[PDB]
């Protein structure tokens, strides 16, 4: 029914059938990406034609293809051959990651490197990482993965505690060749284990934690209809899921009186990159785009009740395609629940004698993914007062290396001889805005200090200024915490009762952006990460800040290319791209398993309503 | 038993008796401040002498006094006459705020101003505010309060909705004279009411919220002994309460194996200033130090179970003295409870096949105070991983004015003709550090970008740098969000197993600091608010960043004076003073009652432990 419904197992199977029938999915083909296409702007087609987009990989080396199909009409709408050496390789297949360790196990150079370190190949695990784009001419036209070694002493051992430094190998996953084996020298392999479930390391488990029971006797306050349409405390939205981006929120709107007022048309984390800052040749190439290269939704965890999600939880089990086009369900991959959120508003008035207190609550929509040693949680929150917030939670096991005898300026020591290279976790939130409709504009708001003098004799006055970003070329902005800089998305054609354009204010955490030298490969490939805010004019094919094909793709696509069009964004259908991230200098406390660290952003109403929208909240 | 125990009603009664019998509490005397004194450095002297510090005001204009008494021996240890014209006026008495409206009610100038506006004097409430600035000549030596008018139509009416602009009066509360009435012109009094409990404004109340039950079948995981000593998940501390500062945390320590390791000796919000940025003569002097001038602890609210504090709550009911020395209990003034705090650590490992998830929780200690129209919540959090955090919650009703015809650059419009002047809420957290002992030092840590070239050919490297603050003259620091600046408090004499000084890292929110012109009276009186972080050498008499007698003092007192001593702070008993605040440009959504907005800071372990201190947390 709803054109925003989740993809069904049936639709996935249908796509597979359509491709097979078209002669586009024979035995040598693989689905590297498959997702449902969002409806185009405006009620074009009389009805809603369900379409899917697919990236088809060829294991024999033939050029891949991008194909769009109509599952409703059973037809291929478009199919284009891709020149990967130019526009980029398709995302990595889960089945290719396994290829690396296997191939290296039979390579003389690799075996010789392990023998030199007295390491048994059968106990050496190899972490397969994306290759990026550097100075290796032979990699032109090759589908490459780079491997870093870790020793696993036994089946349940945490290999991350035993990094094999000074060694790295490059592999052509298609031709099944080891292009290079680099050995910069033998480094002692850290000896201590990092088995956080081992009693000798955890010591006796504490028995002081009493239980906390969180329940909802009458059930949750939100309703779920059409499989993924949420209605909660005036909020309305559709919870989508894409194998690349993960959870995606659609049609976020708020009920104000007799009308449903749109706020954000589509909200997603369109990219997430983890750049490493260790200049060692062994890892200086290390940068993985979880979203763009790996597809985070694909690795979403099945969330356990009471453990991952506590309270009255309503689950969604999104379906994705496997490498052959078969539907695969991610059971309980999405948690949805509401939670108490402290005091919302409070005032004890002496004159009126009235004491008033109201509590707040928020709707939570989340999923958690695992990328090798890292695990990331994605959380979207909706508050009673109209605030929208996103929060990323980073945990898992830190990527390790050896710790240099002479110390290091780019690595921290976690244990004897065990290092943790410095790195960042930078996200890009793509917010297709729709403040009271699609006619929107962005204003940069700065606090303004005033000089003592005429009109300000006491020197106490302070103000603010707003600058409307009118063209894309002027919409690449930097944060400025010192001046309390924020960005307001308003609708110049929709005013509140005080005759002011309605709006929402974006509050950033103002964390450092990409630190890499501007001339670096990563600065170019992750250009979006160098600035805090970008505003573009909406366009169907501008989906990710890094373009459609990130794997082994040079700069040239993404935000810098979109912005160049210098389109009008003053009172138009626009998209805000907010960069935010964490800069991680690992601490001893992050070992053997790290406690969650967080980062995000939020948007609060700014003259969107005619007064507080929570005056109708009961005392309960 | 414990020298850090809360003051008892009996102790207050004893102080009253001691003062009375000593002839220091005559009919004209008033207790402007009364608090127990913390133990001095060195608890070697068995059995501590319970001493109280008292500020005695004299309503006849006679010299006030600072008296120290011993309730243990029942004697007056010291009594010093105060020269208010030199060292500042004593905190405002609750009974003085009341005299302002009463005195104005009989002043011909005031009555004429109201008559011209057709306002019934019996319906005009007067918000009594501190002098706000120091300048006027005739005010020197004179104990002044200023008054701003608001119309209350009926007993339960919210007067804040009806400000009477263009009018302000100054009152000498001791001589009981109206020194001046300034009328700059008539402004319409905003017509709409702001009664948030009126169905007319709230509309039909929501019936969509289902209950959320939060319980603890086996009780809380924390224990409370000695009335205020808390032990929870390895944490140990004493919860104190002072009429000026409110909740104060003492001896914060963490159990690491067989050792109780100290982290912070005393933590408190030593000051909180609210400067207004409207250049109008009616309010350009407006600045109130809630802590220093009003005493926030005095106005702490009684917190209702299931409303202000939800869950399994353990209350503390601190006792304070009234203006006459009588004990007054603040029933349920302090809430204490633990709450679930999502996922603590998580990792699903492919190689080991082990899936691990642990949840986090925080211990919460809080109180809420009401200062006229504003209501502020103070929250201290202790996390399982060793993190300590403070969070202030600002709510209540915004201070209003008229919204001038033609607009304003320093006031926002909340309703027809109703304005809300721009202002800030800036706090100062005084942290008497004790990282593994009193020998501490502070290092400013900045992220360091590196240029591509030799040793960094790919231009991916990035580092960090730490600068030790060795003398107070170089310990006045500013934030730098761009470089991810933080401050680490370490103990150079206590190292972790990796031979590195143990420490804790302070993460600020990097919000704007005091915006007023550098030459303003407020910039001098609240100099602490102009810089993000100050470090001083510990001293018994250096309690507040604004000095002991903030009211009507000329400026420079507190931090600027302490810092001028230029003492050694490199490996010494030091105190960190962190300035943090909110810059408020009121929104329509903040009217008629504002939803909570927050600010805070946190400190996380930085090489304090030898590995993660939460490996012993059970799965459950
Ligand atoms: Cu990290
Ligand atoms: Cu405010």
From Swiss-Prot, chains A, B:
Disulfide bonds: 309-335
Cofactor: how bound: Binds 1 copper ion per subunit.
Keywords: Copper, Disulfide bond, Metal-binding, Oxidoreductase, TPQ
Keyword Disulfide bond set for record: yes
Top-rank EC class of the record's enzyme: oxidoreductase
PTM summary: Topaquinone (TPQ) is generated by copper-dependent autoxidation of a specific tyrosyl residue.
Residues where 2',4',5'-topaquinone is found: 374
One GO term (biological process): amine metabolic process
Catalyses which reaction(s): a primary methyl amine + O2 + H2O = an aldehyde + H2O2 + NH4(+); 2-phenylethylamine + O2 + H2O = 2-phenylacetaldehyde + H2O2 + NH4(+)
Residues the entry annotates as binding Cu cation: 423, 425, 584
Induction statement: By phenethylamine.
Residues at the active site: 290 (proton acceptor), 374 (schiff-base intermediate with substrate)
Cofactor(s) for this UniProt protein: Cu cation; L-topaquinone
InterPro entries: AGAO-like_N2, Cu_Am_Ox_Cu-bd, Cu_Am_ox_TPQ-bd, Cu_amine_oxidase, Cu_amine_oxidase_C, Cu_amine_oxidase_C_sf, Cu_amine_oxidase_N-reg
Single GO term (MF): primary methylamine oxidase activity
Binding site for substrate: 288-299, 371-376
EC number per UniProt: 1.4.3.21
Keyword Cell membrane part of the UniProt annotation: no
Subunit text: Homodimer.
Biological role: Catalyzes the oxidative deamination of phenylethylamine to phenylacetaldehyde with the concomitant production of hydrogen peroxide and ammonia.
Family, per entry: Belongs to the copper/topaquinone oxidase family.
Name listed for the protein in its UniProt record: Phenylethylamine oxidase
Organism, as annotated: Arthrobacter globiformis
Source organism phylogeny: Bacteria, Bacillati, Actinomycetota, Actinomycetes, Micrococcales
């Amino acid at each position: 029914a709803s054109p925003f419904r989740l993809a069904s197992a049936g639709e996935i199977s249908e796509v597979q059938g359509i491709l097979r029938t078209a002669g586009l999915l024979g035995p040598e083909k693989r689905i590297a990406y498959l997702g449902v296409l969002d409806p185009a702007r405006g009620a074009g087609s009389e009805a809603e034609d369900r379409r899917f987009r697919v990236f088809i990989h060829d294991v024999s080396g033939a050029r891949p293809q991008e194909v769009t199909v109509s599952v409703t009409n059973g037809t291929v709408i478009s199919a284009v051959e891709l020149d990967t050496a130019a526009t980029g390789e398709l995302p990595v297949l889960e089945e290719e990651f396994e290829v690396v360790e296997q191939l290296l196990a039979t390579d003389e150079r690799w075996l010789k490197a392990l023998a030199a370190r007295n390491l048994d190949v059968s106990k050496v695990r190899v972490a397969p990482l994306s290759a990026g784009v550097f100075e290796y001419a032979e990699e032109r036209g090759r589908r490459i993965l780079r491997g870093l070694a870790f020793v696993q002493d036994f089946p349940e051992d945490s290999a991350w505690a035993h990094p094999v430094d000074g060694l790295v190998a490059y592999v052509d996953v298609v031709s099944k060749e080891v292009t290079r084996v680099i050995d910069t020298g033998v480094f002692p392999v850290p000896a201590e284990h990092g088995n956080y479930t081992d009693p000798e390391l955890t010591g006796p488990l504490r028995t002081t934690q009493k239980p906390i029971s969180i329940t909802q006797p009458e059930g949750p306050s939100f309703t779920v209809t059409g499989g993924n349409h949420i209605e909660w405390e005036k909020w309305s939205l559709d919870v989508g899921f894409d194998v690349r981006e993960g959870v995606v929120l659609h049609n976020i709107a708020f009920r104000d009186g007799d009308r449903l007022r749109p706020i954000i048309n589509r909200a997603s984390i369109a990219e997430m990159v983890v750049p490493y800052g260790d200049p060692s040749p062994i890892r200086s190439w290390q940068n993985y785009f979880a979203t763009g290269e790996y597809l985070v939704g694909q690795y979403a965890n099945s969330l356990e009740l009471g453990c991952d999600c506590l309270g009255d939880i309503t689950y969604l089990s999104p379906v994705i395609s496997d490498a052959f086009g078969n539907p695969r369900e991610i059971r309980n991959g999405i948690c949805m629940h509401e939670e108490d959120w402290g005091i919302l508003a409070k005032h004890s008035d002496l004159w009126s004698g009235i004491n008033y207190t109201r509590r707040n609550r928020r709707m939570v929509i989340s999923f958690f993914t695992t990328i090798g040693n890292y695990d990331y949680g994605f959380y979207w929150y909706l508050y009673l007062d109209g605030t929208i917030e996103f929060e990323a939670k980073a945990t898992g096991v830190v990527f390790t290396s050896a710790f240099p005898e002479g110390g290091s300026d780019n690595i921290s020591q976690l244990a004897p001889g065990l290092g943790a290279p410095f790195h960042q976790h930078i996200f890009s939130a793509r917010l297709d805005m729709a403040i009271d409709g699609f006619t929107n504009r962005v204003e940069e708001e700065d606090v303004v200090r005033q000089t003592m003098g005429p009109g300000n004799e006491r020197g106490n006055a302070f103000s603010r200024k707003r600058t409307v970003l009118t063209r894309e070329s002027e919409a690449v902005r930097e944060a400025d915490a010192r001046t309390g800089r924020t960005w307001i998305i308003s609708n110049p054609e929709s005013k509140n009762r005080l005759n002011e354009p309605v709006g929402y204010k974006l509050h950033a955490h103002n964390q450092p952006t990409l630190l890499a030298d501007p001339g670096s490969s990563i600065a170019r490939r992750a250009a979006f990460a160098t600035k805090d805010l970008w505003v573009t004019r909406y366009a169907d094919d501008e989906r990710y800040p890094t373009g459609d094909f990130v794997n082994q793709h040079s700069g040239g696509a993404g935000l810098p290319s979109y912005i160049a069009q210098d389109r009008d964004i003053d009172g138009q259908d626009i998209v805000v791209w907010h960069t935010f991230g964490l800069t991680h200098f690992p601490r001893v406390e992050d070992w053997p398993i790290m406690p969650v660290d967080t980062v995000g952003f939020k948007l609060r109403p700014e003259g969107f309503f005619d007064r507080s929208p929570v005056l109708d909240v009961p005392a309960n």
